Structure formats: structure tokens, C-alpha cells
Design a binder for this molecule. Structure first.
Ligand SMILES: CCCCCCCCCCCCCC(=O)SCCNC(=O)CCNC(=O)[C@@H](O)C(C)(C)COP(=O)(O)O
Ligand code: SF4
Ligand code: SF4
Ligand code: FES
Ligand SMILES: [K+]
Ligand SMILES: [Zn+2]
Lengths: 208, 126, 95, 688, 90, 86, 48, 114
């Protein structure tokens, strides 16, 4: 399997597994799962009451020093009752490593804002509000950041359509750009591309 | 305490920003999709889907393209179970109806039945 | 091989022409209906049937990797020629 | 329990004895690749794509045919299983033509898909491929035999399910060719399902050919209405246009098959359509008009009617929503004269009890029966998948079938008792030899055709068949859960029209003719203007202009079955709803919308606005019309039998002749099939 | 050499073939070698008898063997194209 | 003006429909002999409560619950229906 | 093309046309497909 | 059914926040009509505010009306500070949109929508 297969990094896999054990036993109040991927990335899956303790630990601990918030992300998964998956990508410059911190909420439970831990998060979780509707409690200036000013709904939710609900045009009668319900001259043609045959037997979910 | 008691049905229709036309007049269909009989694979029949009623698709006067005014005409969701799908439809105020999952019944396969002594299940060729 | 409706409008190789009472002829008013006059069904009909001596011939449209995928055409039917599914060139077994 | 323990990749699973390796791997959620295997066909074992490793066994086994021994560990993902798969896919693709762009199976090909999933990614075949001569097997199935991988699903389908035995393999070796060997035209009633079970593009749909492509199609799950089977279908559409009709799997109805009428009559759905309202002008010709003018001219004549002055015929293709719509509308006028085209006898209980007009056993109850009596039906053409269920029970359960009627071909062998209806009186006395067979039967099953009830003595035929059913069931060793009496309908609108309380047959219109007549899709020609008074006001509400439309005063364009969500009840009492695939063309509207708008114009407004409220009304009239994919059992055969013994009707001397004797009379029965050019090619091809 | 058939004036289902009466007695003797219910097992010897009578098999010997054994004609066509002794050409 | 149709809904197995089932087993045959041209639509279903729908002239429908009745109470309610014509 | 000429084909335009946008020879789009639904034509004879 | 609140423990505090948000909008409407130089009257914009508040008058969950007050404060903050333009403020008044058919019969006349 030499030329075309990605070579596995066993050293970093073992190191990130040991550090995941370390984080799981220092913070067992909040840590739910710890998993290391096959391409050597460490995910810490936490309870959302420990956003500030887990991130402050990873920022300030002498064996962590994850001083850099790379990215902050929600993922909408509608089949879960806590459908929003808040992902924290942290970067350690001292130990040259990355860690993923993941937690959950639904549409109504707020997540505690992490601008006291990372000032990078100020626009990121504001974008998560704008795109998903995840309210972040005790945020300095939480409002929209990317959508238009009168915009209704949260576009990156998966029950939100691709073209939205309203579209704009200029109207010469009222001398004003107006919002009218969306009508496409050509509908977005949905392609059912999924193959009816299983591709990855290692990822097979067990039957009921 | 820092936990309150909400005894109400979970309804977020005011928060999703969807217009009232596409909330109260749409019918979600919750179903496991049928197997494409062009194929023997069954991997597309594993998850619950939510689609909606198909509204009008008319002809573009210029190009002949398929114009639409339905925003939810391409919206297909994917659920692990039926109950997650029903909870998502009730949470968003969508009227739904649910087809139960159709599994193929177990078959009694015998290659020896093709060459029987006294039964009609002999094959005439092979 | 373009032909013309009684309204004067040209007919494409599809067969498309607007009706006499269809309003969408007003888009060509003062302008032109652009058709292509090289009909492919007429041009491939002008190619002669290739006489070959084999029972199965192959066609890739000429040019190697510049044509179409190489397909193998049976020629057992003596009533009908064997036509390529891609390029439309047709073949006949000479015996 | 006698379950044995086997292992699929080490995971323990308890299977029945006789289970194959493929089914044992199916029980843990793993799908072994296959090309010749199909769970409704006999096992061939001749493509070797299912070759799996049993551990501690130095030879891969054919998982479709090998029974699991106790203690086997099936290695579905081992190295030599994968080497077997890649080698067999290499040999499958060695002589396979490079036709994937010009192939209609492309994108929905099993050979493509599990070449991606299980094959290698390149070729070692440096030779010249073979080319197979194409066969001409009819106007329906396009045949390009170079793409054939010789899986013999053809021959097994046509031999076992279609019951034809006229496909086979000629030749030997790599020259082995699948075909008929002669210029033969494979025209069964189920002949288009070899398109479905051909895994490759060797058998495609000739009407669907070149037009669409599977990823861009929108799969809408709907119901067949061409017959009373209630076959569950996928109407696949692309950009607001219907492209084809594929089956859905439903184990109790149509297992995964459909008839050729169901599969190929969708192009009558885009010809001859009623798109705009029409009224008669000053010259007496039909001219286009608005909905306001047409509904006002209908409502002005409706307000001038009362009692038997307004009537309504329901045609073959009408949903229960429009049925209860026009019923409620005409009952606001106090008119009960609501009729169907298909005559069902009203003597005795009539349509009061559901048990004397349903297929009371089930379609799936054919699998449980051991003796079947078929009276006056040709179930091959009246209901082809009910016949397919009878042939499957004939084949697998050694079912005894007997027919009373004309000796039609049924694709199996039956004891032909004769065609005279006096045989029904002989079986009801016991002096006939088949009566003792019915008495000794554990689960007997007597099916009366609804085309036998079209005769003038249909009430006597129904009474005789019910007499046989009650002479069996109340006396012999029939259990009691088992239903014996059955009626096979042929019309999709019929059973829901009987549940809603229509008077079956048009005798109540010939008895006292109205000065205004509604025709919900009524194209049977049962009541023409020679039967009405001088100027009857005929309102045709339909989707095709076939028979009822050229004699109508106001034409109301309605939706077809692909164009509306709409409740249809099959021949066994299972209520089912279609879904909107496309919208109706032009100004055509949904049918109960038209009737409700007519009631609002006339000032007799119906108390429903949305489809859900129509279905609340439909539940009020009979609550099993809204319980979808549910067969509700109907008791009280004894009371219907006691009511049937009151008026002694006599049998006519005419023999039982079903109207559909050969494949010629199959393809055109209703307004969509008669408008179909594909069905016209089918009829022209089977006559020559 | 072709494993499909086309109707020629020398070879069509209206080409006259019939067994001689002593060949009918030999067919009776062939069929009485097999169990009741499996008369279809006599396809190969009766078709070989048809070839030994006629010299080759037109597609009327195949249809006659299909008729007198009550088997489908495709199941005689399969046997005649499978085995190399049956001369489908004169 | 007068009665047009009677609809009777019931379950096949529920104990609330026991009186309706015992009505239809015994008294329906002489009911239909006494009412030869009246449609009496017995419509069994799976989980419904028993119900007596009576449609009069001009679309007017009265609705009578037959839940947990005996056969005698069903006979009395149905003869009240047949005697009313209201 | 004086040295290495383009390969001649019978369908290539012998007369090159420049950008005709803004002229009466400009391109006007239209649907190249035919009518999908065929309508019922009612009979031109009376019905009495 | 033990959920973490947003701002309000129950519906009385929630209605207090609804009431203060309505007070803030009612004070703001004359300034919005002035500085955006809208062609509406102050009474007309106040009727639109009352319409938007009566639109959500069915909600019985404290967290949902906490989010409604939060989004109303965000709309107010985009309107007081001139972040919206005149077009965003006039998008509440659907002026270029045709009046939709309301009853059954006119919806039947124009098309297939229920
Ligand atoms: C220029 C135009 C400007 C447009 C401004 C749009 C801003 C819209 C802000 C909307 C904020 C809300 O919807 S919060 C309202 C939701 N409240 C509830 O669901 C609780 C029920 N509320 C009520 O019943 C309210 O009437 C009261 C006033 C709290 C109590 O009334 P009841 O007593 O009788
Ligand atoms: S049958 Fe499948 S593999 Fe063969 S040409 Fe068609 S799409 Fe390609
Ligand atoms: S044509 Fe298709 S179904 Fe028939 S044997 Fe060949 S590959 Fe199989
Ligand atoms: S699937 Fe077992 S060999 Fe074809
Ligand atoms: K196929
Ligand atoms: Zn070619």
C-alpha cells in the first residue's frame, strides 16, 4: 500500500490518545467522549456547561497551551434532538498540535460565550448566531454579521432552502429595492447522486 | 436551580423565519424511500426522509426551463429514526403524514428446489 | 436541410417551430431566429456504408483518443447494416 | 427453536435451517454483491459475484446458493473474498461494451455501481471484445445484447413469474446468447419487468429510451389506478414532466412488479388532455372559456334541478375525494342518483356490507390457499398481479386452480370446469366432482370476477357463488378467520365508490332520466344522449377527451392520477393515496376543487376547503378510507347470504365470457390507455 | 455458425417434417425409458432420431419434438443449439 | 323531508362495539327486509368508536354515538332514526 | 495558417461573422424543444 | 423538561421583556419615520409594530419569547443606529407585492396553491 495510500502517523496517534486520556481525567465533570481519528486528530466531546472550564484549561494549562482559537463552527444535524454541534478548533503553538472541542445545543438552550477565553470568538459565535440561530449568552455584541439587515431565518440550517424565501429587485414605482417572494426562472435541479451500494464496510451501522 | 420547568409543546415556528404560507399549508411526507427497482442495492433505503408536497413547475417563456415558486421543492432531510423525523416536523409546525418502513419479507431459498422430483418448482432450463 | 413553416419561420433540426398564433414569435420580430443549417441526420446519411470482411468490426470515430470510446459492432444481420451507437457510421459484412 | 448459530465477520446470528449465506449476511445488515441472484427468482448461481470466504475453508462459496452450516464464520470483507470479487468483475467487464454514455442504464447500473464498489479501477483486457446480435422481442423492451452479462434473470422471470418459457440461452461458451432463437415477440402482461431485473443495459425501456437519466429524476411515490390491484409505483419526473413509472416494493400487493399497462401507459397522460374549460357556443361547438363562465353555467342549471333531475356517473379513474365531493353536492340538491359505470348487483345486502364486494381473503391470502375457484374472470388481464400471485402460489405451494368461464390462457395450468353458469349450481349441490375438492380443502378460495357481474343475471351469479362459499365455510373444515368469498374488481374507482354509498351501475338513470348529468371521467359510453331527454345538460369532468367529452355541454378539465394527491381503494379494501408528481396541464384543476368551487358558485357550499377536511368528511362516510395501507376485514358473510336468498334470480343460458380473452384486449381499457401511442404499438404488434 | 434463426424458404416452421410410423414406435420406446412426469428427459434422443431421419434439423423437427413431448419449443431450441451434433444446417 | 341513508360504523374487536356487533348479527336481516330500498351502510373499521350516521333529505346528517350500547339500545336508537324522518 | 493550414471540413463556416450583438443579426434565445402536452381538439361537427 | 433558561424564568418576566421592547419600538417609530424620511405616517408604523407583536401572540414558551425579544432588540438596534437603509425598514410594508387571493374561489381561479 505504498504509493497511493496516505501513510499513517502512529506516533501522533499515540500521543494524541494519551493527551485525550489526560484531558478526560483532569476534567471528568464535562468530558463525555474522547476520540482520535485515523488521520490523527483529537476530538474532545464535552457537556455544554463546561465550555468555559474546558477551553480555559486548554488555553492556560502548562501541558496544553492552546492559545490560538483557529475556528469556531456550528454544524446542524437535524436528526439529533440537540441538533447544533458547536465545534472549537484550537491550536497549540508550544506543543505544535491541534485539538477539537465539540459540544451541543438545540434551538432554545443557550451556549455560554467564550470571548472571555478567546477574543477571536467574538465574530465567530456571532456568525453562528447569524447562520444557525444558536444564542450565545453573555456576549458583548451579539447580532447578525453576514446576512442582510431585514433577514428572517438562519440560512445554514438544513431545513432552510438553498435559494431562500425572499429575493430582491429594484422597483421603479416606489424608487426602492424591494423584497418579494422568491421565484426561479430555472429551478435548482436536485440530483439524487447516492449509490445504492455500500461503499465503506468499516463504517457500517449495526441494524436494529 | 438554574433550570426552569417548561410544560409546553416544543414549537419554534416563530423563530425559523419561514413565511406562514410555507408553514401552515405544506404537508411533509415522512418515509423510508423505496428501492430503485433498476438496481439490487439497498443502501439508499436505510434512513428516513422528509420531503414536501410538490407545487407547480411551469415553463419558462424564454428558454423553456422549469420555473418554480416553491422554496421547499428541493428540501429533503435525513433522519436516523422515524421518531426524530416526527419530532422535527412537530417542532417546526409542519403537518406531516408517515409511511411505515417496508422491509422485504424473508424468503425460503433452495437451489435444490429447482430440481425437484414431484413439485412444480422445477426449472425447465438453467 | 432546413425547411420552412407557412409562417415563414425556419424549422430547426429538432423539428421546433413556433405556431402561427404563438406570441413568442415576437422575439424574432426585427431580429433573427438563429438555426444551424447543417443537419446531422442528413450529413451522416451521406457517408457510405463501409464494406468490411470481418464478422465483428470496431469503431472509435477516427483519431484514436480524439474520437469516442471503441465499440465493437456485430454484422451478422444481412438485412440491416451495423450502425455505431456513437458516431453513426454504418458497416456491412461483404459476404 | 431449531435456529443454528452462524457468524458473519465474527458477529453471532441465529438463522433458520435452509438459510443461504447471503441471507445470513443480510440479517446483520451486509449486502453481498450479486448479479444473477434475485430474491423472487429461483437461484441460478452463475455469475460468481457472491463468492465469499468461509474461514478454515480453502474455497470461496456461492453465497446465493450455499446453505449456512452451523458454526461457519462468513468473512465478507476478507482478502480472498475481495480477490474473488475483483477477478469476477474483471471477467464481467472483459467483453462488456464501452456504452455507458449511450446506455440508458448509466447512473442506475448495478454493473457500474458494484464495479465501483467491488471491482478494480482499470483493465488488463488487451484483446478484442465480442459483439452480440441484437434481438427484436417487441415494441416495449429495447434489446442490445452486447451488454448482456448472461445472468439469466430473463429466463427465470419469463419461466416462473411471467410463465412464458420462451426466452432461453442458445449457443455455448462465450458465444452463449440470451434470446428467443426465433424472431419472436415477447408480449406478456408483465413483460416490462425484465427491464427492471436486467441489472445491465441489455434490456431497457423502449419508450423511455434516451429521454432521461436517473440522477436528474424526482422520485414521487404513488399508486397505480389502471386496475383494482392498487400497485404501488414510483412516478419519476424530471422538470415538471413525467418520465417513466417504476414499481415500489409492496409484499402484499405487487411484490415488486407492475403490468405493462401500468409501466407504459404514461404517454397517454400527455396526449388528448383537457386543459381548459369548454362550453357550447351559439353554433353548438365546444369553445374555450374561463372557469367563472363554465362553473356559472353549470351552477345555473344545477340550481334549476331537484330530485331525480340531476344525476352523476363516476368513471373508472376517479378518486374518493371527488366521489364524496360530487355525492355531497348532489345531496345538497336532494339527489341520490349517483352511479358508477361498472355494474355490481344490488340485490340482497348489495353494497351495505363490505364483505360481499371485496377481495375478502387478501391478495396475499392466495399464498395461504390450497384450492382456488375462479368464476367468470380472466385474472391474467383484469388484474395481472393478482394473477401473478396465483401463479406464485401455483408454483411454490402446489395450488389447485379451477376456472368457470372461457378457457383463457392464465400462464399456468388449471382445471377448466366449463363455461356454463349451471356449474355454479352443480357445485352448490355437490353432484359436481370439484365440489368434493372444495369441501375437503383446508383453505378454499372462490373468486368471482366483477366482469361476470356485468351480465344481466349478475345477481344470480353472485348469489350462486356466495351459496358455494357459504356451503363450504359454514359446513366444512374452514377455520373461521379464513374468508372464502371474494370479488376481483378491475376498476380503481369502484370499491371506494361502493364504500361511499354510490349505486353501482347506471340502471337508476335509465329508470328515470335526468335533465342534467355529471360525468366524473365517465368514458365507458354506458349512457349516451340517445338515452337522455331532449336537451340534457351533460357536464363532463375529466382529464381526457375520449367518450364522455364530445357529447358534453360544459367540459371541466380535471387532474389525472399523477397530478393529484388522491385516495384510491384497491380490490381488497386497502385505502391508498397517490402523491402529486406533476401539476395538471393548463387550466386543469384538481377534481374536488372543481366540485367545491361549483358548490360555492351555486350557493350550496360544501363544508370543506382543504384536502384534510375532505378526508375528514371521507372518514365520516366510512372511516377506513383514511387508514392508508390498511386492509380492514369485513365480517357478516352469513347475513349477506341470508339476504341473497330472498329474491331468487335465474341464470341466463349465455356462457361466462370475460371481455379480455387475449393480449389484444389488454392494452386499451380506459381513457389513458386509449390515448397512449405505446399501447397502440402494443395492440398493433400483438395483432400482426 | 449462428445461434439465432431466420426464416428462409428452405428452413421455416412451414417446412414439411414428420416422423415415419416406425420412428413413432421408436419414440414411444425412448419415452418409456424415463419416469412418468419427466417426459422432457427424452428431448435429446428424439431430436437425434429426427436428425437421423432427416439428415439435419429444420425448425420443424424442433417444433415437432416440442409438440410430441409437450415441452416448450425454446427448450428444444436450447438443446439443439447447445450440442454440436445437431446439424442446424443441411 | 325524509331519511335517505343510514351509516353504521363499528370496530370488529372492541368491547365498545359489542352491542353494535350483536345488533348486526341478529336484527340486520329483518331490518333490511323491512327496509328494502334504504341503504344501511355497515362500515367496520379498526379502532373507531361506534357511530350511527343518518342522512336525511338535502344533505342534512344527524350523528348518534352508539358507544358501549347493548343490542337493544342500538335497536331503539335505530328505530328512533327510522321513525323520525327529520 | 499560410504555413500550417487548418484541417478542412465541409461544415466549417466559409464566411466568418464578427460579433453581431446590437444588430438585427443578433442571437435571440428560444426553446428548441417541441410542445409536451398535446391538447384535446374538440370536434368541429355538432353534437345533436 | 428541566431546561436552562435564556433570560426569563417564567412567562411573567418574559411578558415584562415583551412590554419593554414594545415601549422601545413605540418611542422609536417617530424617529424612524423622520430620519429614514419614510412615506408612511407615525400611526401607520405604530400599527405595523402592533401587527408584528400580535403576530407572535400565541407563544407560551418562555425561552421562545426570550429569543423573540432578543431578535426584536436586534431589529431595533439596526433601526436606531442607521444600519438599515430605507428599503430594509419599508420591507415590513409589502407594497410592491400583489394582494394574494384569500378565499377558496379566487385561489381556485389563479392556480393550484391551497
Ligand atoms: C417600522 C416597523 C417596525 C416593525 C418592528 C417589528 C419588531 C417585532 C418585535 C416582535 C417581538 C415579539 O414578537 S415578542 C411577543 C411575543 N410574546 C408572547 O408570545 C407572549 C404573549 N404576549 C402577549 O399576549 C402580549 O400581548 C402582552 C403585551 C405581553 C400581554 O398581552 P395579553 O394580556 O393581551
Ligand atoms: S450496462 Fe452498465 S456498465 Fe454496461 S454500458 Fe450500460 S451503464 Fe455501462
Ligand atoms: S439480458 Fe439482462 S437480465 Fe437477461 S440474461 Fe442478459 S444481463 Fe441477465
Ligand atoms: S449471485 Fe451467487 S453467483 Fe450470481
Ligand atoms: K435494465
Ligand atoms: Zn463510431
Amino acid at each position: 500500500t505504498r504509493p497511493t495510500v496516505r501513510p499513517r502517523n502512529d506516533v501522533a496517534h499515540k500521543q494524541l490518545s494519551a493527551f485525550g486520556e489526560y484531558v478526560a481525567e483532569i476534567l471528568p465533570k464535562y468530558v463525555q467522549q474522547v476520540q482520535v481519528s485515523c488521520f490523527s486528530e483529537l476530538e474532545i466531546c464535552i457537556h455544554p456547561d463546561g465550555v468555559i472550564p474546558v477551553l480555559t484549561f486548554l488555553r492556560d494549562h502548562s501541558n496544553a497551551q492552546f492559545k490560538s482559537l483557529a475556528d469556531l463552527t456550528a454544524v446542524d444535524i437535524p436528526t439529533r434532538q440537540n441538533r447544533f454541534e458547536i465545534v472549537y478548533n484550537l491550536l497549540s503553538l508550544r506543543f505544535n498540535s491541534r485539538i477539537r472541542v465539540k459540544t451541543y445545543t438545540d434551538e432554545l438552550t443557550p451556549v455560554e460565550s467564550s470571548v472571555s477565553v478567546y477574543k477571536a470568538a467574538n465574530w465567530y459565535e456571532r456568525e453562528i448566531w447569524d447562520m444557525f440561530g444558536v444564542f450565545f449568552a453573555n456576549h458583548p455584541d451579539l447580532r447578525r454579521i453576514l446576512t442582510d439587515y431585514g433577514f428572517e431565518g438562519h440560512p445554514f440550517r438544513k431545513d432552510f432552502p438553498l435559494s431562500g424565501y425572499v429575493e430582491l429587485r429594484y422597483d421603479d414605482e416606489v424608487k426602492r429595492v424591494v423584497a418579494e417572494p422568491v421565484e426561479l426562472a430555472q429551478e435548482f435541479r436536485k440530483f439524487d447522486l447516492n449509490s445504492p451500494w455500500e461503499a465503506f464496510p468499516a463504517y457500517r451501522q449495526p441494524p436494529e | 436551580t438554574q433550570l426552569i420547568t417548561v410544560d409546553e409543546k416544543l414549537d419554534i415556528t416563530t423563530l425559523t423565519g419561514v413565511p406562514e404560507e410555507h408553514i401552515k399549508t405544506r404537508k411533509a411526507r415522512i418515509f423510508v424511500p423505496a428501492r430503485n427497482n433498476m438496481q439490487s442495492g439497498v443502501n439508499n433505503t436505510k434512513k428516513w426522509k422528509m420531503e414536501f408536497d410538490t407545487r407547480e413547475r411551469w415553463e419558462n417563456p424564454l428558454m423553456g426551463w422549469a420555473s418554480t415558486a416553491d422554496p421547499l421543492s428541493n428540501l429533503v432531510l435525513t433522519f436516523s429514526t422515524k421518531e426524530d423525523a416526527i419530532a422535527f416536523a412537530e417542532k417546526n409546525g409542519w403537518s406531516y403524514d408517515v409511511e411505515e418502513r417496508k422491509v422485504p419479507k424473508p424468503k425460503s431459498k433452495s437451489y435444490g428446489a429447482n430440481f425437484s422430483w414431484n413439485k412444480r418448482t422445477r426449472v425447465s432450463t438453467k | 436541410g432546413v425547411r420552412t413553416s407557412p409562417t415563414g419561420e425556419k424549422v430547426t433540426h429538432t423539428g421546433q417551430v413556433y405556431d402561427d398564433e404563438d406570441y413568442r414569435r415576437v422575439r424574432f420580430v426585427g431580429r433573427q431566429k438563429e438555426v444551424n443549417e447543417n443537419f446531422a441526420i442528413d450529413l451522416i446519411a451521406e457517408q457510405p456504408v463501409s464494406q468490411v470482411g470481418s464478422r465483428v468490426i470496431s469503431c472509435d470515430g477516427g483519431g484514436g483518443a480524439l474520437g469516442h470510446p471503441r465499440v465493437y459492432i456485430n454484422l451478422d444481420k444481412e438485412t440491416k447494416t451495423g450502425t455505431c451507437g456513437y458516431c453513426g457510421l454504418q458497416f456491412r459484412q461483404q459476404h | 427453536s431449531n435456529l443454528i448459530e452462524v457468524f458473519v465477520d465474527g458477529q453471532s446470528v441465529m438463522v433458520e435451517p435452509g438459510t443461504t449465506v447471503l441471507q445470513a449476511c443480510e440479517k446483520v445488515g451486509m449486502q453481498i454483491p450479486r448479479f444473477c441472484y434475485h430474491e423472487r427468482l429461483s437461484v441460478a448461481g452463475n455469475c460468481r459475484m457472491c463468492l465469499v470466504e468461509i474461514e478454515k475453508a480453502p474455497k470461496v462459496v456461492a453465497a446465493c446458493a450455499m446453505p449456512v452450516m452451523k458454526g461457519w464464520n462468513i468473512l465478507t470483507n476478507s482478502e480472498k473474498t475481495k480477490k474473488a470479487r475483483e477477478g469476477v468483475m474483471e471477467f464481467l467487464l472483459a467483453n462488456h461494451p464501452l456504452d455507458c454514455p449511450i446506455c440508458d442504464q448509466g447512473g442506475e447500473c448495478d454493473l457500474q455501481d458494484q464495479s465501483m464498489m467491488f471491482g478494480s479501477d482499470r483493465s488488463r483486457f488487451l484483446e478484442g471484445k465480442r459483439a452480440v446480435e441484437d434481438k427484436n422481442i417487441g415494441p416495449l423492451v429495447k434489446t442490445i445484447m452486447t451488454r448482456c452479462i448472461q445472468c439469466t434473470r430473463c429466463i427465470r422471470f419469463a419461466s416462473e413469474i411471467a410463465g412464458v418459457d420462451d426466452l432461453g440461452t442458445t449457443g455455448r461458451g462465450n458465444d452463449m446468447q440470451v434470446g428467443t432463437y426465433i424472431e419472436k415477440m415477447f408480449m406478456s402482461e408483465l413483460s416490462g419487468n425484465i427491464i427492471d431485473i436486467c441489472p445491465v443495459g441489455a434490456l431497457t425501456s423502449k419508450p423511455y429510451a434516451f429521454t432521461a437519466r436517473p440522477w436528474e429524476t424526482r422520485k414521487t411515490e404513488s399508486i397505480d389506478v389502471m386496475d383494482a390491484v392498487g400497485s404501488n409505483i414510483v412516478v419519476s419526473t424530471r422538470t415538471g414532466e413525467v418520465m417513466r413509472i417504476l414499481p415500489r416494493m409492496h409484499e402484499d400487493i405487487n411484490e415488486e412488479w407492475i403490468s405493462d399497462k401500468t409501466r407504459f401507459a404514461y404517454d397517454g397522460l400527455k396526449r388528448q388532455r383537457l386543459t381548459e374549460p369548454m362550453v357550447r357556443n351559439e353554433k353548438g361547438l365546444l369553445t374555450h372559456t374561463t372557469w367563472e363562465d363554465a362553473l356559472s353555467r353549470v351552477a345555473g342549471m344545477l340550481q334549476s334541478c331537484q330530485g331525480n333531475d340531476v344525476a352523476a356517473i363516476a368513471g373508472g379513474l376517479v378518486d374518493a375525494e371527488a366521489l364524496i365531493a360530487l355525492k355531497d353536492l348532489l345531496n345538497r340538491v336532494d339527489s341520490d342518483t349517483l352511479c358508477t359505470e361498472e355494474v355490481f348487483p344490488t340485490a340482497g345486502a348489495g353494497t351495505d356490507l363490505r364483505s360481499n364486494y371485496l377481495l375478502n381473503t387478501t391478495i396475499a391470502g392466495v399464498e395461504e390457499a390450497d384450492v382456488v375457484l375462479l368464476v367468470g374472470t380472466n385474472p391474467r388481464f383484469e388484474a395481472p398481479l393478482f394473477n401473478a400471485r396465483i401463479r406464485k402460489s401455483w408454483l411454490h405451494n402446489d395450488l389447485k386452480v379451477a376456472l368457470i368461464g372461457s378457457p383463457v390462457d392464465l400462464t399456468y395450468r388449471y382445471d377448466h370446469l366449463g363455461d356454463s353458469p349451471k356449474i355454479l349450481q352443480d357445485i352448490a349441490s355437490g353432484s359436481h366432482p370439484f365440489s368434493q375438492v372444495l369441501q375437503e380443502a383446508k383453505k378454499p378460495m372462490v373468486v368471482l370476477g366483477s366482469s361476470a357481474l356485468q351480465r344481466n343475471d349478475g345477481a344470480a351469479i353472485l348469489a350462486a357463488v356466495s351459496n358455494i362459499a357459504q356451503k363450504i365455510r359454514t359446513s366444512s373444515g374452514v377455520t373461521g378467520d379464513w374468508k372464502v368469498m371474494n370479488i376481483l374488481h378491475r376498476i380503481a374507482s369502484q370499491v371506494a365508490a361502493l364504500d361511499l354509498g354510490y349505486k353501482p351501475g347506471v340502471e337508476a338513470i335509465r329508470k328515470n332520466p335526468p335533465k342534467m348529468l355529471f360525468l366524473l371521467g365517465a368514458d365507458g359510453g354506458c349512457v349516451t344522449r340517445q338515452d337522455l331527454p331532449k336537451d340534457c345538460f351533460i357536464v363532463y369532468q375529466g382529464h381526457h377527451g375520449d367518450v364522455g367529452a364530445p357529447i358534453a355541454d360544459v367540459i371541466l378539465p380535471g387532474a389525472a392520477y399523477t397530478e393529484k394527491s388522491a385516495t384510491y381503494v384497491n380490490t381488497e379494501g386497502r385505502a391508498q393515496q397517490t402523491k402529486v408528481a406533476v401539476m395538471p396541464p393548463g387550466l386543469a384543476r384538481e377534481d374536488w376543487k372543481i366540485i367545491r368551487a361549483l358548490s360555492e358558485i351555486a350557493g350550496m357550499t360544501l363544508p370543506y376547503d382543504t384536502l384534510d377536511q375532505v378526508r375528514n368528511r371521507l372518514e365520516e362516510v366510512s372511516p377506513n378510507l383514511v387508514r392508508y395501507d390498511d386492509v380492514e376485514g369485513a365480517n357478516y358473510f352469513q347475513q349477506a347470504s341470508e339476504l341473497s336468498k330472498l329474491v331468487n334470480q335465474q341464470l341466463l343460458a349465455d356462457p361466462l365470457v370475460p371481455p379480455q380473452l387475449t393480449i389484444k384486449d389488454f392494452y386499451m381499457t380506459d381513457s389513458i390507455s386509449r390515448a397512449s401511442q405505446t399501447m397502440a404499438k402494443c395492440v398493433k404488434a400483438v395483432t400482426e | 455458425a449462428l445461434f439465432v434463426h431466420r426464416d428462409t424458404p428452405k428452413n421455416n416452421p412451414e417446412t414439411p417434417f414428420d416422423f415415419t410410423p416406425e420412428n413413432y414406435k421408436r419414440i414411444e420406446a425412448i419415452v418409456k425409458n424415463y419416469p412418468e412426469g419427466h417426459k422432457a428427459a427424452a428431448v435429446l434422443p428424439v431430436l437425434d432420431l429426427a436428425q437421423r431421419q432427416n439428415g439435419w434439423l429444420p425448425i420443424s423437427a424442433m417444433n415437432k419434438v416440442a409438440e410430441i413431448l409437450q415441452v416448450p419449443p425454446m427448450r428444444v431450441y436450447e438443446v439443439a443449439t447447445f450440442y454440436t451434433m445437431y446439424n442446424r444446417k443441411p | 323531508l325524509g331519511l335517505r341513508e343510514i351509516r353504521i360504523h363499528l370496530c370488529q374487536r372492541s368491547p365498545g362495539s359489542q352491542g353494535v356487533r350483536d345488533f348486526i348479527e341478529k336484527r340486520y336481516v329483518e331490518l333490511k327486509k323491512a327496509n328494502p330500498d334504504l341503504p344501511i351502510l355497515i362500515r367496520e373499521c379498526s379502532d373507531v368508536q361506534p357511530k350511527l350516521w343518518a342522512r336525511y333529505a338535502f344533505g342534512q346528517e344527524k350523528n348518534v354515538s352508539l358507544n358501549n350500547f347493548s343490542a337493544d339500545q342500538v335497536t331503539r336508537a335505530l328505530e328512533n332514526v327510522l321513525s323520525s324522518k327529520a | 495558417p499560410t504555413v500550417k493550414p487548418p484541417t478542412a471540413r465541409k461544415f466549417i463556416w466559409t464566411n466568418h461573422k464578427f460579433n453581431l450583438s446590437g444588430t438585427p443579426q443578433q442571437y435571440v434565445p428560444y426553446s428548441t424543444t417541441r410542445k409536451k402536452i398535446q391538447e384535446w381538439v374538440p370536434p368541429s361537427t355538432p353534437y345533436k | 423538561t428541566s431546561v436552562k433558561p435564556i433570560f426569563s424564568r417564567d412567562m411573567n418576566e418574559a411578558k415584562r421583556r415583551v412590554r419593554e421592547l414594545y415601549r422601545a419600538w413605540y418611542r422609536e417609530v417617530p424617529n424612524t419615520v423622520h430620519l429614514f424620511q419614510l412615506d408612511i405616517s407615525v400611526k401607520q408604523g405604530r400599527d405595523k409594530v402592533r401587527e408584528m407583536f400580535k403576530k407572535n401572540a400565541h407563544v407560551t414558551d418562555p425561552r421562545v419569547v426570550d429569543l423573540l425579544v432578543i431578535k426584536g432588540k436586534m431589529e431595533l438596534e439596526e433601526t436606531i443606529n442607521v444600519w438599515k437603509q430605507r428599503t430594509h425598514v419599508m420591507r415590513f410594508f409589502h407594497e410592491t407585492e400583489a394582494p394574494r387571493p384569500k378565499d377558496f374561489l379566487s385561489k381556485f381561479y389563479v392556480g393550484h396553491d391551497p
